[PDB]
Structure formats: structure tokens, C-alpha cells
Design a protein around this ligand. Structure first.
Ligand SMILES: Nc1ncnc2c1ncn2[C@@H]1O[C@H](COP(=O)(O)OP(=O)(O)O)[C@@H](O)[C@H]1O
Ligand SMILES: [Mg+2]
Ligand code: NI
Length: 745
């Protein structure tokens, strides 16, 4: 039966300030409706005249590839293209081009499996372009990657293989980073971005072929896309789907996709000798560094791939290995050693450096390259010339606590399957070696066989909103390859209703619709959207952008006091979220610019990479706010309301991540969890109630990035949530009872 609302138990949608803001924006949007998307353009001067769609062969395409003129653009092929062409033609998938074409031509969905390095991501979509000729039928081909870095780097490489400009006929799309145009035929993109395109066009009508790549990684976005496309093909006989995977055991995929056929590429990996440590290695970074330097000093020529876990750790390793490499050249006459980082947030000009040839030695001992990478390099891309892998056995992995309902990103041991994939990267060129920084027994007995798919390790708040925007009513029966626990889904539905993104019958509100237009977690989107109602949308836009990048404050272990003093320049007491606004504002100041911005960040213990990323995100979010008619406004800094307005806007999104100082640590409003303020913040005595950005789970529970709030504001802004009937007996409830009493008198 329809839920009943009253003053005692009010309607979360009728009492949401962001919902008011979205209703205003929506009416403004109706006054001037958005034009439809720019149409595709293409080139056609008869070059494909001799080819028939879905009846082409490898020979016909080779004739076109060998021709004088690039058939996709009408410009003469360069000499560089021709040299690239000869080399990629030795890739293993080329030997099965006709077998692949036949499967593609005769089936709507197919599964394609092959080892990393075999040429799946770069070659197959080019094979499809010849047979499908998508640009001659007003369409594109999409190829999704779980990893940003893979999509960006392969798109750059495939633009060169196809002899076209990046962003034109070959382009990429990542959240906040678009490199496509009306000319784009082949779009590499993260799986999350094709999911966002589907939210706007449920049938994905722009694509005639969609290739879901690296499916063995089983990311959440990839799982949703699989479930969606298994329905879209029923409506779209003109859509073909290719599922590509590294894991040569793809039985489960074929079954899930209606017994689709499988094309398997036989492996061509050279033998790799495995080395283990005799004992447990307690401190793996220094063991890794020693191992890389030993290899460099004693092994024959061949590059090194070191797997680490995250960007600060990799930059620290790059610095130490570079220094120690240089010491070896000068002290022992080792060959030159170049050292490159690879991790998720790296800028594309820096991604490309990993493919540079090793330096030439002028002294008789081998010059060598070390790439220090996350598990991006486990299966998603290949650096030619690797012969040695160092595997500390760890990666950063999302874990989920069902009761607490909290996702945590933690460094933990990898699976045996991941360890096998890491070792395999040493055998792409010739017999290689893999140095595992753990015992053969830890590998045989202690590592789990296989990591669980991401959907079983996620809060599903974004996922539920996406599925709703996609027009899925019955979330429980959505056809996931591995369904999540139904309770996780139900908790997500309830949160979204409290945020007023869904009403109580599970339908999208104007706020839910508008929130779905922002590539942000729902709490952030709702905070942003509502913020012009609190007269601080300029400031909240900054804050949301800063919450979308990592912690910008550098704190070296042996330089804490100077790093802490620098942060205090920007820190707002009882207001970590305002600290974020202060640092971004200083970063964008004329003064920092005149100081020289790179130097300015270093001297102030700030990460330029992170700030620069926030600045781009802020520009892209601003463009969405303009597109969807969310006013950019602000309040005089000297207004007595200036900081109140910011705290209120924050509360409008984050009212469910609130903690109260214990009467007799803090206690969370949601689930009554005992927590400590994370040591990165010390609050004053006036911070009885705070909003936190993050719940941190180590041996104890902390909340991190905390700003104080008046509890009266919480009741005012989120009365359906702060309904005392909702609360268990205890400290929080008591304190809230007293606050309500007093708000009346
Ligand atoms: N970014 C790149 N720059 C230069 N060469 C590359 C690049 N990426 C891949 N290659 C080469 O192309 C081959 C095919 O790579 P790719 O299509 O990524 O294979 P897969 O997707 O099957 O793991 C690799 O063996 C490597 O030789
Ligand atoms: Mg690939
Ligand atoms: Ni059922």
C-alpha cells in the first residue's frame, strides 16, 4: 500500500531542498530544450566500393590496408603506418582473422579469448571496422575497458595503426576526459562511460558493434553492461556484441550469452622461470627495490616490470630506484637504467613514456628499462621487451562490509590467477623470469584462487540509480551474471529515497533524473544540485571537484612538521571540507601562478597532479551545471552566513554520514557505530556534530574528512531521516530528543 506521510513522518521528496533546486532547473530547461546530439560525419569516395558488409574476408581488407590511400579518410597512407602495419601483422590474432570474421558475420554475440599481448584490443576492433564499415551506415564501434589508462593508451596506439589523428576517426572517452568528435568511428572508452551513454540512449543506437573487453576482470560496470546488452540484442537485430577475455576458460560466458560461440587464440607465451623467497617478506617495498637492482646488475638484457599498488608508493619507488640505479652506474659501471611509473591517474603524455626503448649502454653492460606499475599491467596492456617481472603479491582491492555497509579500498594479497597473469607478462618476447616476493608455499596454499566479482563487493547506491535511469523497474530480477545480496540492493533503494532521488514507489524524481546526469556518487550530485538554493554553488562546485581527487596534501614520513605547517596555511578548523575549498582557491590564485605553479605546489607540500585533475573536473562539472540550468552563485565572504551556507549544502547531501561526539570518540547516526576522528584531524570543543566524507576501517574505525554542523540544520534539511521514530535507543536519540524539545521552546 502507498506509504502515508505526515509532519511526524514527512515525505523525503517534499522536504528536499535539492529537489526544489532540480524542479527549478527542469522548468528552465523546458524553456529552451537541448538540441539533439551533433551528427556523425564520415569520408566516402568509393574506397570501400568492392566490399560487402558482413561478407568481407581478410584478403580484401589486406588489399585495402596495402593500398596507397587510407580508406577511412582519403589521405595517402604515411610511411610510418606501413612499418607499423608490417609488425602488427605478426600478432597472433592475425592468423585467425578469417575465422573471426566468419564468427562475427554469422552470430549476433560471440566470445573471443586470448592471452594478453595477443592483439585483442588493438587489432579486433580494426577487423570489425573493415567488415562492418560502421561509418558508411551512420554508426560507430565501441570497445570498453575497465581501466582508464588502457582505454587512453590503446586509443593512442590504434590511431597510429590506422594512420588517423587521435580524437578524429579513433578517439577515447573517460569520465571528465573526452577525446572524440563527429569524425570518430572507433571509440575506446571505459566501461563506466558506455554505461553512462546507455543511461541516455537505452538501445545505444549509435553503435553497430559493441566490444566488452577485459571481461574476465568482472567489474561492476562490465557486469551491468553484459546484463543490459543481453536484452538490447533482442530489440536490435542490427547490433553485434563481442565479449573479449584473457581467461581461456570462458564456458560460463558462452552459457550466459545464449550458447554464443567461442573463438580462442592459442597461447604463445615463452617459458617463465619462477623464483620464490625462502621466507615471508615482512616489508615488501624494500625487498622489491633490492630485487630490481639485483636483476639490473646480474641478468642479461631485458626490461623489468615491477607490480606495486598505488601512486604515492610507485612515485616513492621510482625515486629510490632511479637514485640507486644511478649509484650503480657510477660505482659498478652498470648500464643505464630508465625508470617509469604507471598508475590510474597518470596523464597521457606520461603514460606514453612507458613504451620508450631502454637507454643504450655506452659501457658494455646492458642498458635497461624498469616500469613500476599497478595491475594495469597485469592483463590490460603490454610493454614490448619485458623479460623480468617482480611480483610483491599485493594490489589495492575494494572490500565491502555488509553489516556496516561500507566499501573500503585496501592493499591486500592478490589471487593465484593474478599471480599467474603477472608472471606471464615476462614471457611475451622470450623465456623470462618472475621473482615472487613470497614463498612457493604461500603461493600454493595461502593465496585465494580467484577474486570475487566487484558487484559482490560494492555498495550499490550508484548502481541502483543507473539501473533506474536505464528504465529497470524490477531490480531484484535484473539478469546479473552473479546477483548481489538482495539486502544490499534494498539498502541502496532506501538511501536513494532519503536523498529524494527516488520516491517511495521506486520511481525517479526530477532530482534523481538530474543527479543521473552527473558522473558522481549520488550524495555528491545531490549536494551539488541543491547548492544554488544555499547561495554557495560556486563553492560547493569547488568542494565536489576536490572530493573527486585524492588527498592533495603531501606528508613525507621524515618531514611531518614542515608538511603539517604548510597544510595549516589552508586548514579551516572543524571544517576539512572548507580546507579543500581554501587549497583549490590558492592553487588557482594569481600569486601561485606568478610564483610558478609547479614550484608553488612543491614548496607548499601539495600534489600538482591531483589539483590539476580537480581543476579539470571543476570545469567539466561547471559545463554540466550550465547545460542543466543550475545557477552558479555565491555569498559575500564577510556575510555571517558564508560558512553556514556551505555547511548546510554539505549536509543536504551527506546527512546520512553524520557522527555525534559521545556524551561520556564519536557515534555514527547511521548504524550507531563507535568511531574515532581520524588522526589527520583534531576538532575543537564546539564540534558535537560532524559530517564525514569517509569511514576508515583498520584495526579500529575512524571517520575522515570531517566538518562540524549544527544538528538543528540536520533536522531542518533532512526531517524524514532525522525522524526520531527511526532511531534505536541511545546516546544519539537522546541528544536528538533534547535538540527537538529546545527547537520548539
Ligand atoms: N600502446 C602501445 N604501443 C606500442 N605497441 C603496443 C601498444 N599496445 C600494444 N602494443 C603491441 O601490440 C600488441 C597487441 O597488444 P593488444 O592488442 O593490447 O593485446 P591484448 O589486448 O590482446 O592484450 C602487443 O603484443 C604489443 O606488441
Ligand atoms: Mg587488451
Ligand atoms: Ni523472484
Amino acid at each position: 500500500s502507498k506509504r502515508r506521510f505526515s509532519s511526524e513522518h514527512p515525505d523525503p521528496v517534499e522536504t528536499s531542498i535539492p529537489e526544489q533546486a532540480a524542479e527549478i532547473a527542469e522548468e528552465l530547461s523546458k524553456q529552451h530544450p537541448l538540441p539533439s546530439e551533433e551528427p556523425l560525419v564520415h569520408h566516402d569516395a568509393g574506397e570501400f566500393k568492392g566490399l560487402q558488409r558482413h561478407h568481407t574476408s581478410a584478403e580484401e581488407a589486406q588489399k585495402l590496408e596495402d593500398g596507397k590511400i587510407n580508406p577511412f579518410t582519403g589521405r595517402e597512407f604515411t610511411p610510418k603506418y606501413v612499418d607499423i602495419l608490417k609488425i602488427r601483422r605478426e600478432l597472433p590474432v592475425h592468423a585467425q582473422r578469417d575465422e573471426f570474421l566468419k564468427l562475427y558475420q554469422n552470430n549476433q554475440i560471440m566470445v573471443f579469448v586470448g592471452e594478453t599481448g595477443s592483439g585483442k584490443t588493438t587489432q579486433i576492433p580494426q577487423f570489425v571496422l573493415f567488415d562492418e564499415m560502421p561509418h558508411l551506415e551512420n554508426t560507430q564501434v565501441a570497445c570498453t575497458q575497465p581501466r582508464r589508462v588502457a582505454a587512453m593508451s590503446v586509443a593512442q596506439r590504434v590511431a597510429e595503426e590506422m594512420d588517423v589523428k587521435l580524437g578524429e576517426e579513433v578517439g577515447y572517452s573517460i569520465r571528465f576526459e573526452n577525446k572524440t568528435s563527429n569524425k570518430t568511428i572507433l571509440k575506446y572508452m571505459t566501461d563506466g562511460m558506455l554505461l553512462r551513454e546507455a543511461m541516455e540512449d537505452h538501445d545505444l543506437s549509435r553503435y553497430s558493434c559493441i566490444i566488452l573487453d577485459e571481461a574476465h576482470e568482472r567489474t561492476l560496470a562490465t557486469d551491468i553492461l553484459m546484463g543490459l546488452l543481453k536484452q538490447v540484442v533482442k530489440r536490435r537485430p542490427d547490433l553485434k556484441i563481442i565479449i573479449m577475455s584473457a581467461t581461456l576458460d570462458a564456458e560460463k560466458f558462452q552459457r550466459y550469452f545464449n550458447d554464443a560461440p567461442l573463438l580462442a587464440v592459442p597461447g604463445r607465451t615463452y617459458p617463465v622461470e619462477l623464483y620464490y623467497t625462502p621466507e615471508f617478506q615482512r616489508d615488501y617495498l624494500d625487498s622489491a627495490i633490492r630485487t630490481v637492482l639485483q636483476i639490473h646488475a646480474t641478468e642479461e638484457a631485458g626490461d623489468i616490470l615491477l607490480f606495486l599498488t598505488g601512486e604515492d608508493e610507485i612515485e616513492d619507488a621510482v625515486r629510490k630506484i632511479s637514485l640507486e640505479g644511478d649509484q650503480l652506474v657510477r660505482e659498478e659501471g652498470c648500464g643505464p637504467l630508465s625508470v617509469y611509473p604507471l598508475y590510474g591517474s597518470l596523464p597521457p603524455h606520461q603514460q606514453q613514456r612507458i613504451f620508450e626503448p631502454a637507454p643504450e649502454s655506452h659501457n658494455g653492460r646492458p642498458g635497461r628499462k624498469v616500469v613500476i606499475s599497478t595491475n594495469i599491467a597485469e592483463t590490460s596492456l603490454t610493454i614490448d621487451g619485458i623479460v623480468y617481472v617482480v611480483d610483491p603479491g599485493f594490489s589495492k582491492q575494494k572490500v565491502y562490509n555488509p553489516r556496516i555497509r561500507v566499501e573500503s579500498l585496501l592493499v591486500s594479497p592478490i589471487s593465484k590467477a593474478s599471480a599467474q597473469q603477472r608472471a606471464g607478462r615476462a614471457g611475451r618476447t622470450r623465456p623470462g623470469k618472475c621473482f615472487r616476493l613470497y614463498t612457493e608455499e604461500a603461493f600454493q596454499k595461502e593465496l585465494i584462487e580467484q577474486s570475487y566479482p566487484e558487484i559482490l563487493r560494492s555498495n550499490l547506491s550508484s548502481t541502483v540509480l543507473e539501473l533506474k535511469k536505464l528504465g529497470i523497474d524490477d531490480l531484484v530480477h535484473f539478469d546479473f551474471m552473479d546477483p548481489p545480496a538482495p539486502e544490499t540492493m534494498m539498502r541502496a533503494l532506501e538511501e536513494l529515497n532519503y536523498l529524494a532521488c527516488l520516491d517511495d514507489e521506486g520511481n525517479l524524481t526530477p532530482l534523481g533524473r538530474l543527479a543521473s546526469q552527473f558522473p558522481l556518487d549520488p550524495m555528491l550530485a545531490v549536494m551539488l544540485i541543491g547548492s544554488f538554493e544555499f547561495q554557495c554553488s560556486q563553492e560547493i562546485l569547488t568542494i565536489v571537484a576536490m572530493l573527486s581527487v585524492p588527498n592533495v596534501f603531501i606528508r613525507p614520513t621524515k618531514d611531518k612538521k614542515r608538511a603539517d605547517d604548510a597544510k595549516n596555511i589552508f586548514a579551516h578548523p572543524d571544517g576539512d571540507h572548507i580546507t579543500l575549498l581554501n587549497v583549490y582557491h590558492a592553487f588557482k590564485s594569481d600569486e601561485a601562478y606568478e610564483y610558478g605553479i609547479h614550484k608553488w605546489c612543491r614548496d607548499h607540500y601539495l600534489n600538482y597532479r591531483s589539483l590539476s585533475a580537480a581543476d579539470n573536473i571543476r570545469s567539466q562539472l561547471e559545463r554540466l551545471m550550465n547545460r542543466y540550468n543550475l545557477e552558479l552563485n555565491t555569498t559575500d565572504y564577510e556575510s555571517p552566513k558564508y560558512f553556514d551556507n556551505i555547511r548546510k549544502a554539505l549536509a543536504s547531501g551527506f546527512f546520512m554520514q553524520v557522527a555525534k561526539k559521545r556524551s561520556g570518540g564519536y557515534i555514527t547516526v547511521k548504524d550507531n557505530q563507535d568511531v574515532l576522528i581520524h588522526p589527520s584531524t583534531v576538532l575543537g570543543h564546539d564540534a558535537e556534530w560532524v559530517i564525514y566524507n569517509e569511514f576508515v576501517l583498520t584495526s579500529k574505525n575512524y571517520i575522515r574528512t570531517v566538518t562540524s554542523v549544527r544538528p538543528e540544520w540536520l533536522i531542518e534539511i533532512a526531517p524524514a531521516y532525522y525522524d526520531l521514530s527511526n532511531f534505536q535507543k541511545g546516546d544519539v536519540k537522546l541528544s536528538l530528543e533534547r535538540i527537538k524539545e529546545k527547537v520548539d521552546r
